[PDB]
Every structure is written in structure tokens, then in C-alpha cells.
Design a binder for this molecule. Structure first.
Ligand SMILES: NS(=O)(=O)c1cc2ccccc2o1
Ligand SMILES: NS(=O)(=O)c1cc2ccccc2o1
Ligand SMILES: [Zn+2]
Length: 258
């Protein structure tokens, strides 16, 4: 794998090694709020994170992942558009070099400063590697970030970043409560899509919350001090690690709210 977000290996290049990049259910997409239909059949989401066990934070060269113990049903997503139970495996963000870009989904073409992805896999397939091969294998909860007031529950993540500056570095990250990253409302849009980094597999039910969370300038500035490169290599700041909106094709975005 030599894909990235640089000048010569960014999203417009990915198709050359991952031809699914030009598929019919790629993500992210623009959410046209006037075209998205309210679906009175969609249920409230069930976010059950009381028992979550965070373990480690990793700079993988394209973002940082906060990893969870997904060996049992401790932090799960159910309900909403989903059948069955999806276990939280990791969360990560995508963000910009400036506040005017960074999110992957857009809302009536508006870009947010960043987007959080809480990634879950369908326990009927037993492990994540099997789940990504299935059209209903994953559920990703996407949450927009705007810059304004600090997000108190994000600060513990921000403060550890200085210890995982470069690709391949990790740090123990236990006892982190991902409930502190949610907005007040769980109203959402949903549609069938894909992973947004290679392998770009078409295995995700996307659940994108309407209400952004607020983070401070200082919090997002610390995201932008991370590096894409490894230790001692030429410094490439980890910024603009987002894929653009892809064609919606033959898909409907449904709204949980009137
Ligand atoms: N198609 S790709 O995975 O994004 C990829 C782009 C690319 C550019 C230069 C060298 C290796 C590369 O690998
Ligand atoms: N950015 S995402 O769609 O949440 C995503 C999670 C994920 C895990 C493994 C490989 C690609 C991935 O892409
Ligand atoms: Zn993501």
C-alpha cells in the first residue's frame, strides 16, 4: 500500500490499485438535505457504550485510531436502520489544513472542519475481516466537527497526540469514554456505502448524525501537528486526510427526523 493524501498518491489516484474506487456505492457523498426523505420506519439509534473498553491509540500513517476491545459485546450499535448488533472496533477522524474543509460527507455542499468515524462490525460475521466482505458487514457512525467552544471529552485524545506524532507509533489509551464525543441529538441520515480509505469495500451502512459537535481551534490545531511520515523522515503534516464526495448513483439517503 502506497496510497495516501499527497500530491501524487491522493484520492484521485486510488482507483489504479483499488478499482472499486469507481464503484456504485462509494463513500463519502454529499447529503442534499432537501432530497433526503424522512423515513418514519427508521428507529432511534441505540448507542450502547457504557461498557466500552478503549485499549490503545495508533498513528497508522493516514489518521489516528482509538482501538477498543471488540472480543465481546461491550460497546455496540443497534437499531436505526440496522438489523443485529455491531461492535465498536475503533474510531478515528478526518480533518483539514484549515477549518473550511476536512469532513468527508458534506451537507448541501458544506464542508465541516473534521469528521469522526465510529466503526462497528456486524457480529453475525464473527470477525472484522469477514464483515468487510459483506454488504451489511459494517456500520459507521459519522459525526461532524465544527470549530467553536472546546469539546471537553475530546481533550484526553488531543493531549496524547504529541506521543504518537509519527506513523507506526502507539500509546496505551485505556479508560476513554467515547460517549463524550457525541452531540446531544441522535437524529441522522443513512445510506449504503463504502469504506472511505482503501480497500474502499462496499460493506458499510452509513449513519451520519445531523448535529455537529463543537471543538475548539486549539483542539483541531493539535490534530494538524501529527505527521503522515515515520520517525525521522521528512515532515509531512497529517492534514487533509479526507476523501471527497463520490457520485451518489442509484442511492437514496433517508432521514430519521421530520
Ligand atoms: N493507486 S494508489 O494506491 O493510490 C498509488 C498511487 C501511487 C502513486 C505513486 C506510487 C505508488 C502509488 O500507489
Ligand atoms: N473511513 S471509514 O470508512 O470509517 C473506514 C474504516 C476502515 C477500516 C479499515 C480500512 C478502511 C476503513 O475505512
Ligand atoms: Zn473514516
Amino acid at each position: 500500500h502506497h496510497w495516501g493524501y499527497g500530491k501524487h498518491n491522493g484520492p484521485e489516484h486510488w482507483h489504479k490499485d483499488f478499482p472499486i474506487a469507481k464503484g456504485e456505492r462509494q463513500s463519502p457523498v454529499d447529503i442534499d438535505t432537501h432530497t433526503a426523505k424522512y423515513d418514519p420506519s427508521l428507529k432511534p439509534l441505540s448507542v450502547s457504550y457504557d461498557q466500552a473498553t478503549s485499549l490503545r491509540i495508533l498513528n497508522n500513517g493516514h489518521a489516528f485510531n482509538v482501538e477498543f476491545d471488540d472480543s465481546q459485546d461491550k460497546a455496540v450499535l443497534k437499531g436505526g436502520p440496522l438489523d443485529g448488533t455491531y461492535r465498536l472496533i475503533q474510531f478515528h477522524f478526518h480533518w483539514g489544513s484549515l477549518d473550511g474543509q476536512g469532513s468527508e460527507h458534506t451537507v448541501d455542499k458544506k464542508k465541516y472542519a473534521a469528521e469522526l468515524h465510529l466503526v462497528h462490525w456486524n457480529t453475525k460475521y464473527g470477525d472484522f475481516g469477514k464483515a468487510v466482505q459483506q454488504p451489511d458487514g459494517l456500520a459507521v457512525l459519522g459525526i461532524f466537527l465544527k470549530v467553536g467552544s472546546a469539546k471537553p471529552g475530546l481533550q484526553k485524545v488531543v493531549d496524547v497526540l504529541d506521543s504518537i506524532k509519527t506513523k507506526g507509533k502507539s500509546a496505551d489509551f485505556t479508560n476513554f469514554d467515547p460517549r463524550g464525543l457525541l452531540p446531544e441529538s441522535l437524529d441522522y441520515w443513512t445510506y449504503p456505502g463504502s469504506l472511505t480509505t482503501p480497500p474502499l469495500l462496499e460493506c458499510v451502512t452509513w449513519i451520519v448524525l445531523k448535529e455537529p459537535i463543537s471543538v475548539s481551534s486549539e483542539q483541531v490545531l493539535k490534530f494538524r501537528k501529527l505527521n503522515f511520515n515515520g520517525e525521522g523522515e521528512p515532515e509531512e503534516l497529517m492534514v487533509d486526510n479526507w476523501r471527497p464526495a463520490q457520485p451518489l448513483k442509484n442511492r437514496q439517503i433517508k432521514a430519521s427526523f421530520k
